[PDB]
């Protein structure tokens, strides 16, 4: 005899609840640098 | 047909013209002439 | 041969090399089926 | 922090960067004698350190040039010729692709349609009476600026993006559909891959019959994509290690390889060309950094 | 849900009358610009 | 959706007909490193 | 052992006035929402 | 045929082609895969 | 003739940090320095009330908890460029002739309005990772 396992996905719509103030961001200004190549140049803005 | 008018020529401002993405309607092919580039396309600018 | 011809694999082996390699680096000999109406499925086997 | 105002800081350095790259400051004395038009002019004194593409003029006899005084960005070949009154001489990748075995027999006839006069016979005669292929006719660069006045004047890319100037509409390299395959188990793996010609030649009985080869792959490393080559090409291989030796053909090797240059995964785009209405299909890759490496064999 | 309500609907047609610009245009190049004469009074400036 | 499908011993053969479940390389090596059994069960099962 | 204010947690800063969509939940306010009007046109889907 | 199963196809919004043809399967622009989905009987058809 | 209407275009919506209900989940402060701290963790001190105990049972002692919360830090990061074309058009005016003025303006607006999306970029990315992140510590309802 055989036991076949088989797995499924579903698509789900999940909520989420969370205390007030429950963690905490510390982040950066946005910091700007500029690759400047021959035929464009491009901006990156990081921000940690 | 030019495209160029549309990239540089006067616009009207339009809110929530479309409450879906238009995603699915560029790579599902909703429309009839479309013209669409992901880096800047440096063509608008040979004034023929 | 009559095992492949059985069980309905009607491939060859793989072969040395760059075939089985790519397997190894890993990947799928088998075409996408043209016709698909439910997604995605797969059935792993246990004997008993 | 402010942010809009650093990134117009950072804008306004690229621009200031840019000026510095193309004019330079004047520390001679700079008296008042010169008229306005020299006086402009030695307050902003170019200098050609703003392109940084490499080009190179070249003339060759219009009657080649058949597809390819219309649609800008083909590969060109450089064929030594024994004439002393025209030493080199300029070919299409198409103009080669004809007697190339690969190209199956519409395309092929098509395009000899395109290409049928009494110079491009010679030229074809010429080629054919040439013992191997690969250092009597040679890769040389893409096209950019075709003139087509008597003797038409191409520009030719040897290293950079291709443009003529203004750095508009950036032409990029246009390959023939069925010439080109990528060897490689994914293809289009992450990124930017880079573009090979493969001339892979082949034996019908009597003559050598050459094949061009286009492929895209994500390997840089050269030993890699001629390794992946002779997996691919092992069956033929076998059948030229019977024939190079009964043969007494001045040639030592299957084929070559030779990198175009750079390219982008999102700019690889289907399409066809028309020539005196021969729909043609290409896919024409998009931005090209021009790169030539040296030429490897694999035997 | 059915209530009557009292709504402020138009009555007439709206107009739309060519000038000397879109007449000269239609007659010499086969094409209409709509709103050429405010087009043409922003094109140069800032607020295109 | 409500569609009746079935599974059979000529469709599990693909998944049973391998000839790595005919092999007994495996299962001696581990059944040979796996240590030898007590005393009690020793006498009992060990003594062919 | 006291401190009153941790400057790394706690530092001052502008307030005002908006809405939320608030449930009572035994006097429980809590703030009630959808991110889809920041989830409307972007590449990423909803990470609910 | 007299031996045609029904509680696979006729208790079912299903086509009477047998090999079912729904072009919401097939990969768009590809005439090839179409033609094997329509008729080719080495790959299989879904739901059986 | 062949007629053109009008021509329209999009607005691309703004979303600011402290409109959405995640900020109140939320409690942000700027520290211009944390690209060069390592780890930022807390330190939490507990102790626990004693009861007493009953007739020939043993007593426990008392008992003071320390624990240390630490930081995960994720970065963010929004790339845009801008064309060569657009860059020689973006100042430095060949002549004054109006279609250069023309594309001057529009280089202008181009740059000023690809820094704007950008910036709004930065913005609904430091929304997503947020949301990521409370979807990564967020246990499942029949656990908790």
New interface residues.
């Given amino acids: 005899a055989a036991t076949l396992v088989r797995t499924d996905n579903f698509d789900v719509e999940c909520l989420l609840y969370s205390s007030r103030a429950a963690t905490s961001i510390i982040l950066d200004d946005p910091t700007v640098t500029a690759e400047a190549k021959d035929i464009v140049t491009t901006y990156n803005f990081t921000q940690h | 047909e030019n495209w160029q008018a549309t990239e540089i020529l006067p616009k009207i401002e339009a809110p929530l013209n479309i409450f879906n993405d238009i995603k699915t309607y560029t790579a599902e092919q909703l429309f009839d002439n479309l013209r669409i580039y992901f880096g800047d396309d440096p063509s608008r600018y040979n004034i023929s | 041969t009559w095992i492949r011809h059985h069980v309905g694999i009607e491939k060859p082996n793989p072969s040395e090399g760059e075939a089985l390699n790519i397997i190894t680096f890993g990947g799928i000999n088998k075409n996408p089926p043209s016709i698909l109406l439910h997604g995605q499925q797969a059935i792993c086997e246990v004997i008993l | 922090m402010n942010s809009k105002s650093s990134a117009r800081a950072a804008i306004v350095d690229t621009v200031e960067a840019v000026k510095k790259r193309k004019y330079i400051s004047i520390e001679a004395g700079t008296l008042n004698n010169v008229v306005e038009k020299e006086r402009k002019f030695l307050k902003q004194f170019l200098s050609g350190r703003e392109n940084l593409r490499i080009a190179a003029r070249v003339f060759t006899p219009c009657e080649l040039l058949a597809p390819e005084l219309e649609n800008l960005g083909m590969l060109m070949y450089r064929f030594e010729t024994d004439v002393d009154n025209p030493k080199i001489l300029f070919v299409g990748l198409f103009f080669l692709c004809s007697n190339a075995f690969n190209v199956s027999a519409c395309v092929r006839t098509a395009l000899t349609t395109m290409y049928t006069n009494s110079m491009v016979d010679n030229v074809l005669s010429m080629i054919n009476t040439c013992k191997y292929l690969e250092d009597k006719v040679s890769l040389f660069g893409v096209t950019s600026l075709v003139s087509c006045g008597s003797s038409c004047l191409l520009s030719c890319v040897m290293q950079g993006n291709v443009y003529d100037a203004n750095k508009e509409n950036i032409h990029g390299l246009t390959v023939l559909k069925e010439i080109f395959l990528e060897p490689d188990w994914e293809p289009r793996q992450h990124s930017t891959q880079y573009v090979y010609v493969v001339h892979v030649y082949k034996e019908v009985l009597s003559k050598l019959q050459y094949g061009i080869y286009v492929v895209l792959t994500s390997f840089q490393n050269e030993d890699l994509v001629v390794d992946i080559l002779r997996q691919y090409f092992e069956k033929e291989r076998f059948l030229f290690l019977n024939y190079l030796i009964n043969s007494n053909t001045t040639l030592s090797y299957f084929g070559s390889v030779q990198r175009i240059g750079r390219c982008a995964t999102e700019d690889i785009k289907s399409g066809f060309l028309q020539y005196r209405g021969i729909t043609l299909p290409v896919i024409k890759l998009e931005n090209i950094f021009v790169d030539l490496s040296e030429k490897k064999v694999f035997v | 849900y059915i209530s009557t309500q009292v709504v402020s609907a138009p009555i007439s047609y709206g107009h739309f009358i060519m000038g000397k610009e879109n007449a000269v245009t239609a007659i010499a190049y086969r094409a209409i610009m709509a709103d050429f004469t405010q087009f043409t009074v922003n094109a140069g400036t800032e607020q295109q | 959706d409500q569609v009746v499908q079935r599974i059979d011993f000529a469709d599990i053969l693909p998944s049973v007909c391998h000839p790595i479940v005919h092999d007994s390389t495996i299962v001696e090596r581990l059944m040979k490193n796996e240590p030898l059994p007590t005393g009690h069960r020793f006498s009992q099962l060990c003594q062919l | 052992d006291t401190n009153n204010k941790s400057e790394?947690?706690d530092?001052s800063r502008a307030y005002?006035d908006?809405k939320?969509?608030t449930l009572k939940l035994g006097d429980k306010l809590?703030?009630?929402?959808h991110?889809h009007?920041?989830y409307?046109?972007?590449?990423?889907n909803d990470?609910? | 045929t007299p031996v045609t199963t029904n509680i696979n196809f006729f208790k079912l919004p299903h086509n009477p082609r047998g090999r079912e043809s729904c072009m919401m399967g097939t990969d768009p622009h590809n005439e090839e895969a179409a033609r094997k989905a329509l008729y080719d009987h080495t790959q299989t058809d879904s739901d059986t | 003739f062949e007629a053109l209407l009008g021509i329209y275009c999009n607005k691309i919506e703004w979303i600011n940090f402290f409109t959405t209900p995640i900020a109140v989940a939320a409690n942000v402060i700027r520290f211009n320095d944390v690209s060069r701290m390592t780890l930022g963790k807390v330190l939490f001190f507990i102790q626990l009330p004693r009861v007493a105990t009953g007739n020939d049972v043993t007593a426990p002692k008392e008992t003071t908890i320390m624990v240390a919360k630490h930081s995960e830090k994720h970065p963010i990061n929004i790339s845009f460029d801008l064309s060569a074309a657009c860059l020689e058009h973006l100042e430095n005016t060949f002549k004054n002739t109006v279609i250069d003025q023309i594309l001057n303006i529009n280089a202008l607006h181009t740059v000023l309005r690809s820094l704007k999306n950008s910036a709004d970029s930065l913005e609904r990315g430091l929304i997503h990772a947020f949301m990521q992140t409370l979807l990564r510590k967020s246990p499942p309802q029949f656990i908790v």
């Fill in positions: 790394i947690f530092k005002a908006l939320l969509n809590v703030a009630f929402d991110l009007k920041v409307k046109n972007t590449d990423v990470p609910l």
